[PDB]
């Protein structure tokens, strides 16, 4: 279960924030938020993305959804405003009205969805027409170093290529506006003499993981009703 | 959770309207009840638990 | 027919000089465009035509149209392009010569702010784009980039100087959804050590860093509606 | 310009259909000719493969 898999990550939630911020800061800066916008953060973890959007773009209302009750208890404890709220929920059934959200953000969570295609349809449903979904992931086909992550995770993960993310967004009714790789330039890469480390056999592989592949970002836009 | 933020929340099962019941209030303790399903989603320490029942 | 600065730049090599400088940030904006193999792309104010050549080389576009108001500029772009899958034409931003809903994506770098009626140009782009198609609008002349304000003293064309918020509002007013707005840093240009300043173009290293890293190129991405 | 790429071109003045007249071609490539507005009657020349589709007031 989600709470079984991620409660140890809530005992480490700040550690995920510190690592993920290296690329999330760039993806968040791209979001076309207008002051006062309502944002839903799917798999909020420590809730940092909502706090960053309020501090830098002035969102008005934020909802940090997580399937781990411990995770959202933590996220709330780290937040100094009631304009950003937290709730327990699941990616397969979003507890928001149709066309009620201006933008949806998700970092390092989407690929744990049980039915990712249905989650995309749920995102298109809750978004207002013209609203955006910013989907940032480190587990994807081209990032060869991530393939082994499934070996230490009990949840069945979805491993899609860049093309598969674009195709799935279109199949859910979202228009793809942008797709990119965001490098992690902050993580220290030791000298070639220091290898192997616990994670890397060669410096070349570490450089490829972080400076070349980085985080995949796909941006979708929810459409108005149209002829089918 | 701020009561005003609950305006766009819906039952995760069928996406119908919820009814709010307050015990401690910014809502700290209480429940959100499904108007069609009768499901009870608790709010504990300001956090609503809106998982579908079986989760 | 009246000549202007752009006609002079096409004759004296400034088309190639603009390509070499603009490519520093254009390469990042082009890389993120969701262009699929076989798509039709229009490049508004193509200059040397480098953006279409890059989209052909990296995205496999099927058809490309490089539009420019300067005949000499498109004659040069055509001469620099060795494939007929990319075509060039003389045209004006105030009335685009494309059918409604005929183009998959529109690209424009360092050109949009010369449009005589920016709101009409945006409406024309929304018209020619197919629903769900994108408009990538990249500019270095805009309100927040204080170092660009002086550019108006060096060109006779009245340029639109908009802030980040004004570009988003203008896109909405023209019927485009705003999908992204980013500041793209120029990580290629040589920014010398602090002791090498003043240079010919910059009084301090801080001013040069602010122009190319803090502000950089503004990219606003619009999506055509149904 | 390839004749196959001209399918989406229109008169810039009113967005009406253009008639193509060819004087010189190389397969799909139209080298010399003109695009004529079916409604406005405006003539947009194709010169060494490049159509000049500026509005007449700018030529
Ligand atoms: N099906 C699901 N429904 C809801 N939350 C889920 C989920 N699968 C995973 N999650 C949550 O998604 C998060 C993934 S970890 C990433 C956390 C945060 N976005 C960051 O960037 O650091 C966890 O907090 C986990 O509990
Ligand atoms: N109203 C207008 N209609 C068409 N082209 C125009 C125009 N105003 C400016 N241009 C063209 O826009 C270009 C601006 S310079 C930028 C050139 C190229 N995109 C680059 O990135 O280097 C010039 O080639 C100029 O002729």
């Amino acid at each position: 279960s989600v709470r079984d898999e991620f409660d140890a990550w809530a005992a480490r939630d700040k550690g995920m924030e510190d690592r993920h911020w290296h690329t999330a800061k760039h993806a968040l800066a791209r979001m076309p938020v207008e002051e006062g916008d309502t944002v839903v953060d799917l798999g909020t973890g420590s809730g940092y993305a909502l706090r960053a959007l309020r501090d830098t773009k002035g969102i008005g209302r934020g909802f940090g959804l997580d399937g781990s009750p411990e995770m959202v208890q933590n996220a709330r404890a780290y937040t100094d405003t009631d304009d950003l709220s937290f709730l327990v929920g699941d990616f397969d059934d979003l507890p928001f009205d149709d066309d009620s959200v201006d933008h949806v953000w998700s970092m390092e969570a989407f690929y744990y969805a049980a039915d990712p295609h249905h989650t995309l349809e749920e995102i298109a449903r809750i978004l207002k027409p013209g609203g955006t979904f910013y989907c940032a992931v480190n587990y994807y086909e081209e990032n060869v170093h991530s393939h082994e992550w499934q070996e230490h995770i009990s949840i069945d993960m979805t491993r899609w290529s860049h093309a598969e993310y674009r195709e799935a967004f279109r199949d859910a009714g979202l228009h793809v506006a942008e797709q990119d790789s965001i490098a992690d330039l902050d993580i220290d890469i030791p000298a070639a003499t220091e290898f192997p480390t616990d994670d890397w056999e060669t410096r070349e592989a570490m450089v490829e993981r972080y400076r070349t592949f980085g985080t995949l970002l796909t941006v979708g836009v929810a459409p108005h009703h149209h002829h089918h | 959770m701020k009561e005003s933020l609950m305006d766009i929340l819906c039952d995760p099962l069928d996406k119908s309207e919820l009814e709010l019941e307050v015990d401690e209030r910014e809502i700290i303790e209480g429940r959100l009840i499904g108007t069609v399903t009768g499901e009870v989603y608790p709010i504990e320490d300001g956090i609503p638990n809106l998982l579908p029942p079986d989760m």
Side-chain angles (χ1 to χ4, degrees), chain A residues 69-155:
Chain A
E70 286 90 331
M71 201 67 78
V72 281
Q73 281 166 36
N74 291 0
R76 182 171 183 276
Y78 308 143
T79 307
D80 297 331
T81 175
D82 287 317
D83 291 316
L84 305 175
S85 63
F86 299 94
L87 65 148
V88 191
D90 186 73
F91 296 168
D92 209 50
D93 292 289
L94 306 179
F96 303 95
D97 285 345
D98 295 12
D99 303 347
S100 64
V101 175
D102 297 297
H103 305 95
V104 174
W105 162 267
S106 180
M107 167 69 170
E108 282 287 71
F110 175 81
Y111 51 83
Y112 296 112
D115 180 352
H117 285 112
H118 181 62
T119 294
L120 291 167
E121 291 159 9
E122 277 292 279
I123 289 166
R125 179 182 67 74
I126 69 172
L127 278 172
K128 290 173 177 181
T132 72
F133 173 39
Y134 271 67
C135 181
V137 296
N138 293 341
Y139 178 74
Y140 60 92
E141 195 66 30
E142 292 89 336
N143 179 12
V144 54
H145 327 85
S146 70
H147 296 181
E148 71 206 270
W149 301 352
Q150 177 67 273
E151 289 179 32
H152 67 258
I153 293 163
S154 300
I155 292 170

Side-chain angles (χ1 to χ4, degrees), chain A residues 29-30 32-34 130 132 134 166 170 175-180 219 221 224 226:
Chain A
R30 291 177 191 196
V33 169
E34 294 302 341
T132 72
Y134 271 67
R166 301 196 306 276
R170 297 191 186 107
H175 299 128
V176 177
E178 191 248 89
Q179 186 179 61
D180 202 10
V219 176
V221 173
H224 276 282
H226 63 275

Side-chain angles (χ1 to χ4, degrees), chain A residues 2-3 5-7 9 13 15-18 20-21 24 41-49 65-68 71 89-92 105-114 119 155, chain B residues 51 55:
Chain A
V2 174
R3 80 170 298 176
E5 184 79 33
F6 292 96
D7 285 354
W9 285 106
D13 46 348
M16 281 197 292
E17 164 182 337
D18 293 334
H20 297 156
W21 181 244
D41 176 0
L42 295 178
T44 198
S46 75
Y48 72 85
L65 178 148
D66 206 280
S68 164
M71 201 67 78
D90 186 73
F91 296 168
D92 209 50
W105 162 267
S106 180
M107 167 69 170
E108 282 287 71
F110 175 81
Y111 51 83
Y112 296 112
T119 294
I155 292 170
Chain B
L51 284 172
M55 303 208 152

